[PDB]
Amino acid sequence: TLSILVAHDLQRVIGFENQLPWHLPNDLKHVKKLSTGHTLVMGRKTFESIGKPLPNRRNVVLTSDTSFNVEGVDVIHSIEDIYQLPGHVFIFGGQTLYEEMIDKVDDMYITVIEGKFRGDTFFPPYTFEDWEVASSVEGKLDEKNTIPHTFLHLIRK
Numbered sequence: 001t002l003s004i005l006v007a008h009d010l011q012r013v014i015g016f017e018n019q020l021p022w023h024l025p026n027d028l029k030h031v032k033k034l035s036t037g038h039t040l041v042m043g044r045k046t047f048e049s050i051g052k053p054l055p056n057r058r059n060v061v062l063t064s065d066t067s068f069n070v071e072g073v074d075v076i077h078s079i080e081d082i083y084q085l086p087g088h089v090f091i092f093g094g095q096t097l098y099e100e101m102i103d104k105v106d107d108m109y110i111t112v113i114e115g116k117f118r119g120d121t122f123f124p125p126y127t128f129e130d131w132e133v134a135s136s137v138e139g140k141l142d143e144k145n146t147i148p149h150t151f152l153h154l155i156r157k
Ligand SMILES: NC(=O)C1=CN([C@@H]2O[C@H](COP(=O)(O)OP(=O)(O)OC[C@H]3O[C@@H](n4cnc5c(N)ncnc54)[C@H](OP(=O)(O)O)[C@@H]3O)[C@@H](O)[C@H]2O)C=CC1
Pocket: 014, 015, 016, 017, 018, 019, 020, 042, 043, 044, 045, 046, 047, 049, 062, 063, 064, 065, 077, 078, 079, 092, 093, 094, 095, 096, 097, 098, 100, 121
């Protein structure tokens, strides 16, 4: 399976100055549950924003840098390399990778953050004309989770 995994706001912001614009522990839990024991594929910049691989899953980084080597990280140098990765593979960011992959994925797991944040990086536009809502689950508001959010699972029609 090839899936997108993304959190974006009401205007499809995903990032600002190499960081997530919001703090939402519930969403990190959602990522952990979905991707543990599977594979994440991310662009070089997304990886460096996090700085280290996420535990208990395969971390694959896409870069043109032939010197790129990080312990606990597998490197690929082409989009075509993604299709040869076994198991459930989640496209994990950022903007460039999403733009390259949105047309190709089976599936999207989107956390819609119901706010308008300042951003410099964006998820590409998409229409529900192309995507069936497999599930839509409201995130629970919390002392630690104070932004309304909805977990969408979208499947290509
Ligand atoms: N939610 C998110 O996903 C988050 C993303 N961001 C940010 O996104 C911002 C914008 O950068 P963006 O480019 O979208 O980030 P990406 O994660 O998509 O990384 C881009 C890099 O990935 C590599 N890459 C992408 N496509 C290819 C390809 N076809 N062939 C070879 N290498 C490829 C290149 O690395 P290289 O230059 O090494 O060759 C490229 O510069 C960054 O500032 C990043 O911090 C910030 C916070 C969160």
